[PDB]
Design a binder for this molecule. Structure first.
Ligand SMILES: Nc1nc2c(ncn2[C@@H]2O[C@H](COP(=O)(O)OP(=O)(O)OP(=O)(O)O)[C@@H](O)[C@H]2O)c(=O)[nH]1
Ligand SMILES: Nc1nc2c(ncn2[C@@H]2O[C@H](COP(=O)(O)OP(=O)(O)OP(=O)(O)O)[C@@H](O)[C@H]2O)c(=O)[nH]1
Ligand SMILES: Nc1nc2c(ncn2[C@@H]2O[C@H](COP(=O)(O)OP(=O)(O)OP(=O)(O)O)[C@@H](O)[C@H]2O)c(=O)[nH]1
Ligand SMILES: Nc1ncnc2c1ncn2[C@@H]1O[C@H](COP(=O)(O)OP(=O)(O)OP(=O)(O)O)[C@@H](O)[C@H]1O
Ligand SMILES: Nc1ncnc2c1ncn2[C@@H]1O[C@H](COP(=O)(O)OP(=O)(O)OP(=O)(O)O)[C@@H](O)[C@H]1O
Ligand SMILES: Nc1ncnc2c1ncn2[C@@H]1O[C@H](COP(=O)(O)OP(=O)(O)OP(=O)(O)O)[C@@H](O)[C@H]1O
Ligand SMILES: [Mg+2]
Ligand SMILES: [Mg+2]
Ligand SMILES: [Mg+2]
Ligand SMILES: [Mg+2]
Ligand SMILES: [Mg+2]
Ligand SMILES: [Mg+2]
Lengths: 461, 461, 461, 51
């Protein structure tokens, strides 16, 4: 009649929770070579990554540089929201404008501008070449870096320095092979694209082709632009922020909260899904139970993010006494999401590449990376030397249950330097490929069927 | 036939005991904002606290200053009993006389007293002003701190310094608004209250109204005086101590023993309950099993205190080999006390605010704070500096099973400094409100229904 | 319906894995004296060792010197494969040529050779005596170390220094006692063996009788030569390497891979068994499950080697998240191998002699010793002194799942010195004999039936 | 500054420059730290003989 651990209710202690350190992946029959294993996986219902890694929406992890680097490596970045709406939207714009199959609204100047104005425009948009259009809107020339580097008088007008029409151009609908042939024949880096009337429509650069060859794994939309995501909260400020981000061209909106089994979070997910769901994907915030995942799935989430106090000495566990070991949390959330085709993003608690393999094996489709990327070169911050070691030096945060509320006021900074993002991603992917080879998993979908062995406390000594 | 751990008896090892570190609170469906979470809870069957915390009856934790500070913060203090009966009764009187709606036995002098005598009475009662009455008992004036501060001659009598009658007074039963309006209209801090014959009956001060505004959460009786509790042992000395404390105006008596599953303790609880039950509440000492709690409930205790060797390296565990992990002990005691409506106080083993949340979720109604408050400014002792650090420098104890009977003779002292009490209480309540937000608990009674997840040893690495 | 550790699939967490530190051997009724316990056990179906220990096929552990020392101690060595095929075959020849009952193809010189050429041959083969043969092929004399140490001019020919025929010889089929009598009556160290025509066919030395007396536990074939094993990989290069090693006289082939539950490895084992199985034994790579052991048995393996990520902080566990605790892995593999009489080799995770006893009690027939032997005098490398301490200073590695693929490019070396191999082997065998005395096991086959007790984390504190 | 004050005209810098980016070697990461990786010397009295 009594429960052995106390009391008379068998459900007072609901489950035994397993973390990453409690389990290992068992070897199985394999004909899979690690170099031939396919590591592509679904981020949402409509977005498949080549490398199943996403960078966290933390102000020490993901800004435009990290987002570009992650999308180039085959994953994706989620821009943090600890900043004004205009600044986050501009970061989305920066990521989307990094590269493309064809620039569809290129920056143009007029013949009357000075060279100082053109230099300012180039610095503002981080480009080096501008088509020149007159008051009619007609393309009268093009001014690039070569023309301006040899000029001293910055007050000179553009019409005096630009390469005047007729130019080397192509019509709308020009094939990529023809465009590159025209670029290589005339030994120029730029090719304006014009309509039937000759007015400018677009611009094609050799640099875009070189980037496409240099980063074959890039995460891109149908226009050849890198994908990016951004985080929003709950409220009306958050609704305005979400609409601005959608206008800027974002691909994924993450309703990013500490505790997503809340009616406000679910209403925000449903509102976003009905309002802008045909264009962007909506990812629901952090859950740790089967019921919360099912609630998010009913609300209409395209992916479910999992983890609530997942770390051992997490501030949520110490201060509030709340948590859920991550392996059991992922198993429970997958049990709710998998029947409906909704992917799962494992967020938090990861320390090594073996943890990534374990989390994917438990049923998650992607892993979100935080502290593993905070010290990298692409993460925000300035690089400084202190005593021969290297470090990275640096109104919002309205979530009532975030860890920054639970910690006392003080100081945090000087995260150590970890090097380029490429090496970290290469190491993590190598570990994942080794695990796939051991378990005989040709794909991530097969890895999600692998078996575990539970180890005792003696196995961690 | 054999038990897997040895022997033939399956009841030799009765249970598996869970401590605080073994469990976490699982997130649940919530609409609760931490700021609007109601943290009030029952201390006994008749006393409800705004903050469900009480300070321990230890000579390093609770004296009159700590008790006043705790009752002002919404909790309560229990005065320790490691001191003579007269001194503990004096501390009870000090706490009860700190503030009131109206002072009912005001300190008065006679016109023949010198200013030195009035100064001595002021220092004795820690007040600054006195009404003056003659042998007839008529109110002949009032002498306050303003009159005395400008007198160089200490040897003068009161009749030459006091403000003579007629005074600004009020009738018995005057309302709060009328009394405060009369105080403000005449720009005075004191208002004597007189009967139909004009003989002095009470005193109303502006400082009491200001205190009521300044500490809105204070734990008070119907007269507006702060509540306080005090500990007693067992024996006839303990009976005399209890009667003296009840005379001094104590609100809670705690029969404080290391092992309450004793006929002496139970008979003492029944005796106190029969003699002074209608006036004060009786709390039974520390238990750790369902049977002991049931025995205390039958004896008539108004609250049951839980914990016998709850600390991991406790002296009781090391020296006597006796103990009970606190989560299981709380579950077992609640299983016996809740059907009868007797609240449970969790005493010992608490290190973080998360532990307080876990103890309340296991079924307890209040938590008793020991070492968490010993370094605070309001705890007894003198603050000193040693080596750049701050430390707090400092016949009875008939409990045969207490830890001081187990520990050898030596030196204990110099507890470290921890700052003001209010900051510690604020941190603990913030943790509790975060836990209530995560679990979706609007009240403490709902928090007592929250579920746990048991974690493995790997979750503590 | 739901699994307590998460999800709905009860086989997601397949088992609970036990390591060496989780178990102890229980004392049982014994009449066994440790000195008289029989420690011999099967390495394969056809090879029985006197001491159930084999040295790892690592380039810091086993080369020719270690193989000879292990065979002389009563175990065996396995030569590593991180070197060219010619060098490994040469080390096989070195081990096989160390000692014998009779040298079947003794090295010879000709009367027209210079003493420098004879010195070169002696240095090459590490001998000190050669019979002399003419162009006819008749034995004309013998030149040994005594004849060469007293000649100053190294330019003199063999015919002027050698002892001329007639010599002391014996006919093919001469017994050992007769040959030793011939050696001792004429006070010589060598005895050529000739056929009816008078042609040289063999050689018998006093040194071989002395070695047989000096190392009575040696692991030898029917010709009195030490047994040796060698590691091969998978692929066509591996097939050529294996054929060369077999031609050099190897006794055991070990298909040495990280993950043997692979069709390629199984095919290699079957091919080798079909080709050279009647001469040599083929041992299959590392497995950790019952199914993998059953596959290796079906492939035709003569013994099964067990262990995949067995160490607690193993690189395979951290980087790939893959492993299996060694006690459970051994139990599972033995369940598949014992019905067919296939011995099990426990490889990895051994730290103490008690672990060797536990591995054998779980069902293994032999244990492979790695890092326990890496710093011994007989292990490869050169002994140096650094800061008062003693250290050991020093295209292939094609296995896709080997740990070196997982470790980052970097630096390793300077293993510490651990004394001679004899003391290590003596200590390990002493521990094993004590375990046999405690469990009442006269043979290793009886030790394989002993029981375990599982201990808690407190038992490791 | 002290060396130039004593009368020297220039100072030769050795170990102060050994770890800089322009010095020979390859930059690597080891455990979160950064390091630089890599018949002649016939001088009879050089330190390399003594060590
Ligand atoms: N010219 C131009 N490029 C843009 C614009 N917006 C984004 N880009 C991108 O910026 C890159 C081209 O920038 P530039 O530096 O002017 O190109 P470039 O002169 O070919 O560059 P290099 O080969 O590095 O000399 C391409 O990846 C474009 O897709 C824009 O308005 N104008
Ligand atoms: N005057 C007076 N106050 C008492 C007595 N017993 C308790 N008190 C409390 O002590 C406080 C008043 O102390 P005083 O020092 O006289 O206060 P005050 O001079 O009016 O106040 P401040 O000048 O603002 O400090 C109130 O909170 C009273 O409730 C008593 O006998 N006389
Ligand atoms: N002489 C000789 N010994 C061989 C040959 N091949 C293997 N051996 C072994 O090498 C050992 C003999 O080596 P030697 O040094 O020539 O022997 P020895 O001169 O009799 O020995 P010591 O004078 O006691 O050192 C024996 O163990 C032989 O079995 C060979 O071709 N010639
Ligand atoms: N489509 C075009 N038609 C005609 N002239 C062009 C065209 N595109 C560029 N030019 C001219 O070709 C010249 C070379 O410029 P280009 O754009 O190739 O390089 P850049 O970016 O200016 O220089 P850099 O070599 O520093 O990257 C310039 O004078 C430019 O005006
Ligand atoms: N009820 C009263 N009627 C008439 N005079 C009074 C009354 N109470 C106090 N006084 C007088 O009014 C003056 C101001 O005293 P009050 O009680 O306001 O403050 P205090 O405690 O004397 O001084 P402090 O400003 O230091 O608090 C004194 O001279 C006092 O004697
Ligand atoms: N079978 C033999 N018949 C005749 N003479 C022999 C024979 N074997 C060796 N001798 C000769 O006997 C002498 C001693 O040879 P032996 O083999 O006993 O020792 P060794 O190996 O030359 O020297 P050491 O004494 O250093 O071990 C040599 O001069 C050698 O030529
Ligand atoms: Mg350019
Ligand atoms: Mg260029
Ligand atoms: Mg005053
Ligand atoms: Mg005042
Ligand atoms: Mg010899
Ligand atoms: Mg000799």
């Amino acid at each position: 009649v009594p429960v052995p651990t106390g009391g008379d209710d068998p459900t007072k202690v609901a489950m035994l929770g397993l973390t990453f350190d409690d389990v290992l992946l068992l070897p199985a029959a394999s004909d899979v070579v690690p170099a031939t294993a396919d590591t592509s996986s679904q981020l949402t219902k409509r977005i498949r990554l080549r490398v199943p890694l996403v960078s966290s929406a933390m102000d020490t992890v993901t800004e435009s540089r990290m987002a570009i680097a992650m999308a180039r490596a085959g994953g994706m970045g989620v821009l943090h929201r600890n900043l004004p709406v205009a600044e986050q939207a501009g970061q989305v714009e920066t990521v989307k404008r990094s590269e493309a199959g064809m620039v569809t609204d290129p920056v143009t100047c007029s013949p009357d501008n000075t060279l100082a104005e053109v230099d300012a425009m180039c610095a503002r948009f981080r480009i080096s070449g501008l088509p020149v259009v007159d008051d009619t809107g007609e393309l009268v020339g093009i001014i690039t870096n070569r023309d301006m580097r040899f000029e001293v008088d910055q007050s000179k007008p553009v019409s005096e320095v630009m390469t005047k029409a007729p130019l080397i151009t192509a019509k709308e609908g020009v094939s990529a092979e023809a465009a590159l042939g025209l670029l290589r024949r005339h030994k120029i880096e730029k090719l304006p694209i014009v309509d039937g009337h000759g007015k400018l429509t677009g611009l094609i650069t050799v640099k875009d082709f070189v980037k496409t060859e240099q980063f074959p794994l890039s995460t891109k939309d149908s226009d050849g632009r890198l994908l990016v995501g951004a985080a929003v909260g709950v409220g009306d400020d958050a609704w305005t922020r979400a609409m601005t981000l959608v206008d800027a061209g974002v691909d994924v909106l993450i309703v990013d909260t500490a505790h997503a089994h809340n009616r406000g979070v679910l209403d925000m997910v449903s509102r976003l899904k009905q309002a802008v769901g045909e264009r962007v994907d909506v990812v629901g915030g952090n859950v740790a139970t089967r019921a919360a995942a099912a609630a998010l799935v009913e609300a209409g989430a395209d992916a479910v993010k999992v983890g609530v106090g997942p770390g051992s000495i997490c501030t949520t566990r110490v201060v509030a006494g709340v948590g859920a070991p991550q392996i059991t949390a992922i198993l429970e959330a997958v049990a709710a999401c998998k029947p409906y085709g909704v992917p799962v993003i494992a967020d938090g608690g990861l320390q090594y590449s073996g943890d990534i393999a374990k989390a994917l094996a438990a049923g998650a489709s992607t892993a979100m990376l935080g502290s593993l990327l905070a010290g990298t070169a692409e993460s925000p911050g300035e690089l400084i030397f202190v005593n021969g070691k290297q470090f990275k030096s640096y109104y919002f945060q309205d979530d009532v249950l975030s860890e920054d509320k639970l910690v006392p006021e003080g100081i945090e900074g000087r995260v150590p330097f970890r090097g380029p993002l490429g090496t970290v991603i290469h190491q993590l992917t190598g570990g994942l490929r080794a695990a796939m080879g051991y378990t005989g998993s040709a794909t991530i979908e097969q890895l999600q069927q692998a078996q575990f062995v539970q180890i005792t406390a003696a196995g961690l000594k």
